[PDB]
Amino acid sequence: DFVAKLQDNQRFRYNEVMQALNMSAALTARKTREFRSPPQEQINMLLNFKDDKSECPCPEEIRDQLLDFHEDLMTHCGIE
């Protein structure tokens, strides 16, 4: 379910930024992540929030559900 909610959100934000182009010198730096950065480091860089702020994309809603699942895993294990 997490990937189901993440992949469509990523494609939606990509469609949004491609529709609202507003071509500049930073749009290429923002959209090199789609063509370059193969999926390994792509997911590595789009999945990082243990400090208070990183370059996480606009799907902030799934961050909370991931934290909830991580807390559930921690309390299912022996970690208090």
């Binding site: 999926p39 390994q40 997911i43 590595n44 999945l47 970690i79």
Partner: protein
């Protein structure tokens, strides 16, 4: 001189879940989420009743 200088100048579905779990096990679980190395040995050195368990 400026003119001379100017002349000189002119002259698909299931790969994503696998990669997700790989990234999760790579950078989400082993990030120092436990501290037991002292309580473990403290309860292991107690001879509640010979030889202690840690001594064994």
């Amino acid at each position: 001189x400026x003119x001379x200088x100017x002349x000189x100048x002119x002259x698909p579905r299931h790969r994503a879940v696998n990669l997700f779990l790989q990234g999760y096990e790579k950078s989400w679980i082993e990030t120092e989420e436990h501290y037991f190395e002292d309580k473990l040995i403290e309860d292991l050195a107690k001879p509640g009743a010979r030889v202690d368990p840690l001594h064994q």
